[PDB]
Every structure is written in C-alpha cells, then in structure tokens.
Amino acid sequence: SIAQARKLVEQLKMEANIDRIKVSKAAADLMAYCEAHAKEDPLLTPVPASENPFR
Template sequence: EKELLRMEVEQLKKEVKNPRAPISKTGKEIKDYVEAQAENDPLLQGISEDKNPFKEKGTCMIN
C-alpha cells in the first residue's frame, strides 16, 4: 500500500506541471480547428467513387 501511495504522489507531481488553460479558450480553439478541417473530412464530405476502396468491383449473377 505504501508503494502504491508513493506511485500516486509521483504521478500527481508530474501532472501538476502540465500547463492549464481555461475551457473557454481551448473549446473555441478546438471548434475553430474542426471547422477549418471540415472540408477535408471524408465523413462530412463523402468519398468520391474513384477513390473509394470499398466500392463494389462488379456484380455476380447466378443463373
């Protein structure tokens, strides 16, 4: 138990050194980044048929 507490204290010492920023600032930065990248996002824009690796190559017919 003592070793676990020591590890936890060491982890907290590392985490306290991380720079902090208010969510009002970081949230706006994330929103701006997502909006700027939206035109390159295939989930929003779709994939053209010639670049789609999952497009069916042909059909198979059984007579």
C-alpha cells in the same frame, strides 16, 4: 504497501504541477480546426460520381 502509496503521491504531485489554461480557448480552437478542415472531408460532404472511388 507504503511504497505504492509513495509512488502514487509523487506521481499525482508531478501531474498536479502542470500548466492549465482556459477550456473556452480549447473549445474555440477545436471549432476552428473543425471549420478549417470541413472542405477536405468526404464524410461531411459526399463527393460526386467522378470522385468517390467506392463505386
């Protein structure tokens, strides 16, 4: 109905007025988070037999 279209148009208006900054910086800090936590990840580097208690 018309009420659903109204609800959609103010919902999309509320979603329109949001702060959007560059995707390149998001890729950069995602890469930074990946490289800064690569040491503390058993799936990246397999832990030795002393560690890895699934054995």
